[PDB]
Design a binder for this molecule. Structure first.
Ligand SMILES: *[C@@H]1O[C@H](CO)[C@@H](O)[C@H](O)[C@H]1NC(C)=O
Ligand SMILES: Cn1c(=O)c2c(ncn2C)n(C)c1=O
Length: 353
């Protein structure tokens, strides 16, 4: 079990002004720290944030959080479940800012909600430095879905923060799971139910959203939404980032207005889906540390059966171990770049059921 700690700095809040926090399981033996960013979409105006507050309140408030969470997949302390980092210090940072971890805005007389995702990550790192992180060799900032995008937006700021606090020895790395989206044409055009590009454009203004400096400098004022797209922000990052991305991500297909029912798929949708997989594969061509199976799924790294999926006979835990070896100073039978070439969901027999 990971134990809840609410942030001692109560100016750093969830959407409703309740304190943000983190779940921690310390490993006294280990100088490895895994900080996992939870996902769960976002909200980008008063009306859709109000709806989220009614039926997804745990993603907007700490008021109802449990005292403990069970570490699963990459957050498991059991080697059987987590061959990769079972002995690491484990941190789960709940997503309660609805801002893809980009926000730097307090609740005030002008703001119904606080969007403090970027500041929550900063505050968790600062408070952990007094709990053993000061002795770390490696800090892996990991995350799934909106948390995966959060890794891309925040990994270099965590590295900068530790450099400026006088910990240049701590190696900051990123693991972005199911956070690598395409600003592609929808299969069918569609209110909130608004394509990611426009929703993110509006979100940044609403959240006072912040993006990595080099990406911000490239795209400039009014175009920072570009930095929420992996293939655009990744090349601007200095920190090593491992990209885990299903070629047919369910969240990508949802925003593209693709709904597979069981009826025969006709030529138009077949070509659309094959084109999406090919586009995803293209964006990963020059990403040296990547795991991209040809599956229709969403998230993997905190799922208990994350060990089961393979690309070219290599599991994700093995790929991550090979990545660790690669960052000592290519390795025989220890690959780090694993992208499926087969063009249809579940052409990989190891895809989740
Ligand atoms: C508390 O958090 C706020 C907002 O991130 C920050 O400006 C302030 O410096 C923090 N104070 C302390 C004591 O950490
Ligand atoms: C750009 N983008 C998306 O496209 C997206 C998303 N979550 C789901 N989608 C589909 N997030 C967090 C995101 O930043």
């Amino acid at each position: 079990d990971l134990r809840l700690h609410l942030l001692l700095n109560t100016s750093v809040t969830c959407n409703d002004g309740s304190p943000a926090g983190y779940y921690l399981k310390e490993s006294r033996g280990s100088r490895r720290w895994l900080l996992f960013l939870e996902g769960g979409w976002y909200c980008f105006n008063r009306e859709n944030c109000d709806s989220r507050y009614d039926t997804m309140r745990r993603l907007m408030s700490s008021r109802d959080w449990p005292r403990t969470r069970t570490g699963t997949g990459i957050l498991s302390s059991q080697p059987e479940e987590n061959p990769y980092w079972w002995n690491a210090n484990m941190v789960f940072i709940p997503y309660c800012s609805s801002d893809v971890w980009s926000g730097a805005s307090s609740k005030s007389e002008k703001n119904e909600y606080a969007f403090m995702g970027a500041l929550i990550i900063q505050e968790v790192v600062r408070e952990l430095l007094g709990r053993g992180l000061s002795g770390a060799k490696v800090l892996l900032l990991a995350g799934s879905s909106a948390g995966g995008t959060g890794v891309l937006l925040n990994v270099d700021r965590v590295a900068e923060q530790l450099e400026k606090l006088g910990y240049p020895a701590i190696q900051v790395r990123g693991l972005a799971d199911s956070g690598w989206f395409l600003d592609n044409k929808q299969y069918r055009h569609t209110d909130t139910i608004c394509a990611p590009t426009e929703a993110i454009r509006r979100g940044i203004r609403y959240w006072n959203g912040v993006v990595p400096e080099r990406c911000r400098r490239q795209f400039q004022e009014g175009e920072e939404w570009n930095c929420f797209f992996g293939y655009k922000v990744y090349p601007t990052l200095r920190s090593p980032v491992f990209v885990v991305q299903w070629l047919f991500d369910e969240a990508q297909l949802t925003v593209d207005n693709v709904h597979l029912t069981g009826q025969p798929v006709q030529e138009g949708l077949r070509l659309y889906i094959q084109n999406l997989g090919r586009e995803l594969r293209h964006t990963l061509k020059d990403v040296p540390a990547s795991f991209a199976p040809a599956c229709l799924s969403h998230e993997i790294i905190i799922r208990s059966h994350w060990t089961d999926v393979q690309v070219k006979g290599t599991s994700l835990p093995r790929a991550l171990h090979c990545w660790d070896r690669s960052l000592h100073d290519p390795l025989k039978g220890c690959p780090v770049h694993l992208v499926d070439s087969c063009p249809w969901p579940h052409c990989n027999p190891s895809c989740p059921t």
